[PDB]
Design a protein around this motif. Sequence first.
Motif, mmCIF file in Angstrom:
data_model
loop_
_atom_site.group_PDB
_atom_site.id
_atom_site.type_symbol
_atom_site.label_atom_id
_atom_site.label_comp_id
_atom_site.label_asym_id
_atom_site.label_seq_id
_atom_site.Cartn_x
_atom_site.Cartn_y
_atom_site.Cartn_z
ATOM 1 N N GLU B 151 -16.805 -22.790 -29.090
ATOM 2 C CA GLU B 151 -16.179 -21.456 -29.923
ATOM 3 C C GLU B 151 -17.143 -20.267 -30.014
ATOM 4 O OE1 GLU B 151 -14.907 -22.183 -34.039
ATOM 5 O OE2 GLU B 151 -13.716 -23.776 -33.535
ATOM 6 N N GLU B 152 -18.387 -20.598 -29.793
ATOM 7 C CA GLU B 152 -19.480 -19.543 -29.438
ATOM 8 C C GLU B 152 -19.062 -18.647 -28.334
ATOM 9 O OE1 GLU B 152 -20.201 -22.783 -30.036
ATOM 10 O OE2 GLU B 152 -22.218 -22.896 -31.363
ATOM 11 N N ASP B 153 -18.231 -18.955 -27.259
ATOM 12 C CA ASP B 153 -17.832 -18.242 -26.224
ATOM 13 C C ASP B 153 -16.304 -17.733 -26.645
ATOM 14 O OD1 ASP B 153 -19.532 -20.529 -24.894
ATOM 15 O OD2 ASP B 153 -19.655 -18.731 -23.786
ATOM 16 N N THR B 154 -15.513 -18.617 -27.080
ATOM 17 C CA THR B 154 -14.061 -18.146 -27.304
ATOM 18 C C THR B 154 -13.806 -17.296 -28.517
ATOM 19 O OG1 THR B 154 -13.496 -20.259 -28.126
ATOM 20 C CG2 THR B 154 -13.399 -19.985 -25.670
ATOM 21 N N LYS B 155 -14.453 -17.583 -29.590
ATOM 22 C CA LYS B 155 -14.422 -16.895 -30.912
ATOM 23 C C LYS B 155 -15.515 -15.942 -31.308
ATOM 24 C CE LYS B 155 -10.865 -19.753 -31.749
ATOM 25 N NZ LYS B 155 -11.045 -20.009 -30.359
ATOM 26 N N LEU B 156 -16.557 -16.005 -30.410
ATOM 27 C CA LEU B 156 -17.966 -14.950 -30.897
ATOM 28 C C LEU B 156 -18.000 -14.183 -29.941
ATOM 29 C CD1 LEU B 156 -20.068 -17.711 -32.628
ATOM 30 C CD2 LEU B 156 -18.627 -15.929 -33.865
ATOM 31 N N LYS B 157 -18.421 -14.615 -28.898
ATOM 32 C CA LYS B 157 -18.861 -13.702 -27.461
ATOM 33 C C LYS B 157 -17.783 -13.102 -26.877
ATOM 34 C CE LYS B 157 -22.065 -15.898 -24.959
ATOM 35 N NZ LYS B 157 -22.566 -17.008 -24.369
ATOM 36 N N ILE B 158 -16.889 -13.570 -26.536
ATOM 37 C CA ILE B 158 -15.820 -13.077 -25.545
ATOM 38 C C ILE B 158 -15.012 -11.731 -26.207
ATOM 39 C CG2 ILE B 158 -13.597 -13.423 -24.300
ATOM 40 C CD1 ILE B 158 -15.062 -16.378 -23.459
ATOM 41 N N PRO B 159 -14.398 -12.153 -27.696
ATOM 42 C CA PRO B 159 -13.868 -11.121 -28.230
ATOM 43 C C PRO B 159 -14.887 -9.832 -28.709
ATOM 44 C CG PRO B 159 -13.361 -13.133 -29.305
ATOM 45 C CD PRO B 159 -14.374 -13.638 -28.106
ATOM 46 N N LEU B 160 -16.196 -10.021 -28.905
ATOM 47 C CA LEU B 160 -17.024 -8.952 -28.808
ATOM 48 C C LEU B 160 -17.175 -8.207 -27.609
ATOM 49 C CD1 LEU B 160 -19.555 -10.085 -31.708
ATOM 50 C CD2 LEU B 160 -17.577 -8.479 -31.954
ATOM 51 N N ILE B 161 -17.386 -8.721 -26.381
ATOM 52 C CA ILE B 161 -17.369 -8.121 -25.358
ATOM 53 C C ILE B 161 -16.246 -7.337 -24.937
ATOM 54 C CG2 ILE B 161 -17.569 -8.801 -22.758
ATOM 55 C CD1 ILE B 161 -19.179 -11.044 -23.594
ATOM 56 N N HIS B 162 -14.897 -7.914 -24.934
ATOM 57 C CA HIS B 162 -13.771 -7.245 -24.977
ATOM 58 C C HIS B 162 -13.658 -6.072 -25.942
ATOM 59 C CE1 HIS B 162 -11.396 -9.904 -22.529
ATOM 60 N NE2 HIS B 162 -11.477 -10.834 -23.441
ATOM 61 N N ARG B 163 -14.180 -6.016 -27.219
ATOM 62 C CA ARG B 163 -14.335 -4.661 -27.993
ATOM 63 C C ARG B 163 -15.155 -3.794 -27.482
ATOM 64 N NH1 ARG B 163 -14.452 -7.702 -33.745
ATOM 65 N NH2 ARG B 163 -14.657 -5.534 -34.297
ATOM 66 N N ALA B 164 -16.403 -4.165 -27.003
ATOM 67 C CA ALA B 164 -17.412 -3.286 -26.383
ATOM 68 C C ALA B 164 -16.798 -2.456 -25.263
ATOM 69 C CB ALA B 164 -18.499 -4.229 -26.064
ATOM 70 N N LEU B 165 -16.146 -3.186 -24.282
ATOM 71 C CA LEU B 165 -15.781 -2.595 -23.146
ATOM 72 C C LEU B 165 -14.474 -1.432 -23.595
ATOM 73 C CD1 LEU B 165 -15.720 -5.080 -20.391
ATOM 74 C CD2 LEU B 165 -17.540 -4.282 -21.773
ATOM 75 N N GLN B 166 -13.930 -1.790 -24.632
ATOM 76 C CA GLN B 166 -12.741 -1.074 -25.164
ATOM 77 C C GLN B 166 -13.242 -0.053 -25.457
ATOM 78 O OE1 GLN B 166 -8.978 -1.299 -24.960
ATOM 79 N NE2 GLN B 166 -9.304 0.831 -25.847
ATOM 80 N N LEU B 167 -14.529 0.040 -26.444
ATOM 81 C CA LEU B 167 -15.180 1.462 -26.822
ATOM 82 C C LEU B 167 -15.796 2.285 -25.750
ATOM 83 C CD1 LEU B 167 -16.490 -0.495 -30.103
ATOM 84 C CD2 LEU B 167 -14.758 1.529 -30.033
ATOM 85 N N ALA B 168 -16.408 1.495 -24.943
ATOM 86 C CA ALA B 168 -17.184 2.270 -23.658
ATOM 87 C C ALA B 168 -16.085 2.851 -22.705
ATOM 88 C CB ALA B 168 -18.159 1.268 -22.930
ATOM 89 N N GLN B 169 -16.244 4.186 -22.452
ATOM 90 C CA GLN B 169 -15.669 4.992 -21.446
ATOM 91 C C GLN B 169 -16.280 4.391 -20.028
ATOM 92 N N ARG B 170 -17.708 4.690 -19.984
ATOM 93 C CA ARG B 170 -18.467 3.742 -18.866
ATOM 94 C C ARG B 170 -18.071 2.605 -18.527
ATOM 95 N NH1 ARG B 170 -24.730 6.070 -20.707
ATOM 96 N NH2 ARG B 170 -24.039 8.243 -20.781
#
Lengths: 497, 495
Positions: B151-170
């Motif tokens: 769950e550390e990957d599937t519920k915490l890290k992966i969702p936050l990484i998806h959100r970071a990339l959605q916010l980043a234009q670069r």
Amino acid sequence: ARPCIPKSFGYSSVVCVCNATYCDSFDPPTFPALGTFSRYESTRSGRRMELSMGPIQANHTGTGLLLTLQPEQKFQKVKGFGGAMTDAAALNILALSPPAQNLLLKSYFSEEGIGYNIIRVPMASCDFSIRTYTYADTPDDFQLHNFSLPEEDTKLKIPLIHRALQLAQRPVSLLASPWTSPTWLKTNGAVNGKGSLKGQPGDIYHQTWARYFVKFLDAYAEHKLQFWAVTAENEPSAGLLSGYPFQCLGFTPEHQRDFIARDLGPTLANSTHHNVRLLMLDDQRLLLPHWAKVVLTDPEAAKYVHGIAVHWYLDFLAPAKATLGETHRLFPNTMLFASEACVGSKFWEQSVRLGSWDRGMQYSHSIITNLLYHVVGWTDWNLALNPEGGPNWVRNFVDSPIIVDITKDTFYKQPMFYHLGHFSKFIPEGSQRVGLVASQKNDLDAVALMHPDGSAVVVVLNRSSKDVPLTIKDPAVGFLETISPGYSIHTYLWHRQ
Amino acid sequence: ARPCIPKSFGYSSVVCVCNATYCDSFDPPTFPALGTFSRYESTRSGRRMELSMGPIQANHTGTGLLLTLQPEQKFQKVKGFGGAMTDAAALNILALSPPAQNLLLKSYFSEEGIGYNIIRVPMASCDFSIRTYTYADTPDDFQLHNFSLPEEDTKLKIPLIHRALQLAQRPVSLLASPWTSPTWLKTNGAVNGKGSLKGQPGDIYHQTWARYFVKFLDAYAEHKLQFWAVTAENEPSAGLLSGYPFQCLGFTPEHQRDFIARDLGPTLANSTHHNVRLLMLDDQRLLLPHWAKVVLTDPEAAKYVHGIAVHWYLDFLAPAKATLGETHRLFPNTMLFASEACVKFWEQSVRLGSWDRGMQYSHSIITNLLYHVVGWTDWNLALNPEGGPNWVRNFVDSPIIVDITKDTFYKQPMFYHLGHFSKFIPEGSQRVGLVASQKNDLDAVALMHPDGSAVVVVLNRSSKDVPLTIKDPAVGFLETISPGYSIHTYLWHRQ
Ligand SMILES: *[C@@H]1O[C@H](CO)[C@@H](O[C@@H]2O[C@H](CO)[C@@H](O[C@@H]3O[C@H](CO)[C@@H](O)[C@H](O)[C@@H]3O)[C@H](O)[C@H]2NC(C)=O)[C@H](O)[C@H]1NC(C)=O
Ligand SMILES: *[C@@H]1[C@H](O)[C@@H](O)[C@H](O)[C@@H](Cn2cc(CCCOC[C@]34C[C@H]5C[C@H](C[C@H](C5)C3)C4)nn2)[C@H]1O
Ligand SMILES: *[C@@H]1[C@H](O)[C@@H](O)[C@H](O)[C@@H](Cn2cc(CCCOC[C@]34C[C@H]5C[C@H](C[C@H](C5)C3)C4)nn2)[C@H]1O
Ligand SMILES: *[C@@H]1O[C@H](CO)[C@@H](O[C@@H]2O[C@H](CO)[C@@H](O)[C@H](O)[C@H]2NC(C)=O)[C@H](O)[C@H]1NC(C)=O
Ligand SMILES: *[C@@H]1O[C@H](CO)[C@@H](O)[C@H](O)[C@H]1NC(C)=O
């Protein structure tokens, strides 16, 4: 001679247990005919400076590593080896009964111990003190009419130094270092933290601080103690760091240069203590060669500087060649000296590990590296600590070669003690490092010196788990066939004619 | 658009307070008109990336400090800037209310924040975890039939990484690093302590471990995340130390050389993830240049190594020329990348509003940039006020501190010191020469954006204000002042 009484505390090797009536010791030194060598051996498995003898032979039966003495390749002469008489060391030693005190001091200072011939003396309080104090805490006393030694000097340090010199046959050299000035001479008004001398070199604050060195030497002279040397300041770089937790006084290399040229040099030179040497830096080797370039390229500072004092604690930040080697190359007539030859206790370990072979190997490994890079002498830090690594008024990540257990009137000699002794006992003042050529790539640490009388000494450290078959060749005598066991240190001694 | 809300915690400077409805942010990026320069300032006194604009003067007189641009003296191209999505960072971020989560991620990843384009992702657990799992904890599972992301990957890290990339234009580059292997692959059978892979390079242990990297990349790709690079191991020198307190895996440089050549290089190259780059070392720069010589003089290892990843501990100073400089000299076509940094057992692990710790960050980034380093990656993106969580209590500081009880987060001076670089040095920026006319207490560095425009960062570590001029021969003289305990970023068009 009495052998080690071993005790394990669950670390890699044993301590040697001493008490009021028993401590391990040596017979007077006694060296054999040409064609014979003496070997002293210490091992993780528990051997503690055990003596054997054997032949140096015309025929070379060994097919492995060969180390060849090159006595015509001559390097530095040795000043010597010792440790620091801190408040903490003096309180620990004096909490033993007098017979045990005498056995602890003999272990370090007698020819039947490891023959220390240097003592470092803090000028007033440091972290290894039970309180903050200077010699001149009464402010606005610019002529230091109220300079005086407290009980820590007159009751603890001075009496133990007298007893150490009485036990030693070898002349003992005293080295003094200050941590802090009186706080009323400092920009920050505190014993610790980021703070330098007020004002600028030449002024009343700098003259007063220089005069404090002379007052210190006068007070010790009134107690029949003379110094070989003083340092310009302990870890001057510490006093440039915001929040530095214990006693310090900040100098940039430029401020040390100017304080030496304008104040400390001329003040010592105009005193009755003009023969006392002055060492600069007294700090981490990573600050070399820069610090030496700033101070020693000014002839008005250079004329007063006898040597460069280095500390081991942060040696991992820079290699010996780039610091000690480059400094010698640039300033070949200014001796290098290790004034705080102590190693840091890794953050996940306790400050004192009774019987740590690893901490012993760190000491012998650093002494060999130092000797291979021009260093003439070593002062360990605290001569003795309690089992908590104290007393200390802040918090410290350091061990000591002798650990005192007050509650049992017993003291423990750590592997560090024997690793130091493999050098200190067998390398008298005036010994000269000479060539020792390895015939092939190897895992040993080794160094050769020649005593003043021309006799040879070789130290071989094996930090590996594997026994290494070894030949040592003296061109004048022949071949010494031996073995460096895994986790061992050997000292070999022989007559060359 | 919104300024810093300052709060003092009694240290040398202020944090900026953010919550569910408020966080400091910038307007969309603008560029100063030709003949003018932009300046962003942060000060110990409390200014936080405050924007001003001045004229570029055709003429200059005086004996004051001059910094001259050498636009034709070209050095390294920049990969980027960011930090690590540890279990601790993700747990802290996801304990905020959703809107506060969004403003935290925007602070780092938005064009309206500081424009991070790196995320370092641990492969399973490290000290900044609340437990000590690997992806394959079934003993002797050499085929990895029980490999899986918890769950550390599937519920915490992966969702936050998806959100970071959605916010980043670069475009964002993901970097993956393992601390430990499964215990059954290790000589000591423990996640921590002194221990290396069992057996020898080429053998079943080494091939399983290399296949573990492919399984990781497979599982992240199932979650629509691709990696730019992996490191061969986090701090391989750590697992050579007896009693090493947390997750480690020991390699000598020879062992690293042989593992890359025999196992990790070929296994990655034969996988569907062959475009993923490999960085060697991922450890403290005192190991250079020796570690680089051992690995990269073996052409069978060299052909698999894209770069050398370096770490540092910012409370210490180390030589840069003798480590980073000599490494670049021997191996100029192998990029140097700073993959981990952080900040006195006497000071707390977290000092809210420490200006000193900010200056340690910007000093380190300038030192690195002056010695060929192409990128600089912070450790934990976010910690709690204790510097945690951390299962061995190895608490450190972080540029963002989350206060779960207050649904609040604090942007430390470190965040702004980082932003002075990350916000204004896009990927592809090239470092260029910048010569001082006299000895000075300033750290400075110059780069050119892909489009030809200029950026200079100046840090003043002294308490003294320093008048200075920046000369660019294409446009003229920027007359300015570096206040004591300031950091400035200057931007100007050159045509
Ligand atoms: C999240 O943080 C923001 C920003 O600090 C908080 O907003 C601020 O709320 C305070 C209330 O303490 C406002 O102060 C008061 O404003 C009124 C109306 O102008 C004024 O008459 C008072 O003298 C006082 O200054 C402040 O204006 C406001 N700032 C903004 C930009 O909205 C907000 O309360 C925080 N949210 C939570 C849940 O804590
Ligand atoms: C030498 C010193 O002169 C002695 O007083 C001291 O007892 C001795 C051993 N020692 C050191 C320590 C703890 C470490 C002190 O802080 C070092 C420091 C300083 C800055 C740079 C770097 C990171 C932090 C800030 C901590 C290293 N315990 N025993 C010797 O230091
Ligand atoms: C990087 C690591 O991968 C992370 O897991 C870890 O959390 C992070 C924080 N940190 C710092 C420390 C140790 C601090 C002191 O160590 C001694 C030191 C200091 C420098 C010189 C020399 C070589 C290294 C740099 C280590 C001795 N532990 N965790 C980072 O370690
Ligand atoms: C000081 O240490 C010595 C050596 O460990 C102890 O001497 C031993 O004493 C016991 C009596 O309990 C004898 O049977 C041993 O033969 C002694 N060994 C030697 C070599 O003399 C002595 O006990 C210690 N002192 C104290 C107070 O414990
Ligand atoms: C391993 O996988 C097998 C087969 O898919 C499954 O039955 C078992 O539950 C797994 N073991 C663990 C510890 O999860």
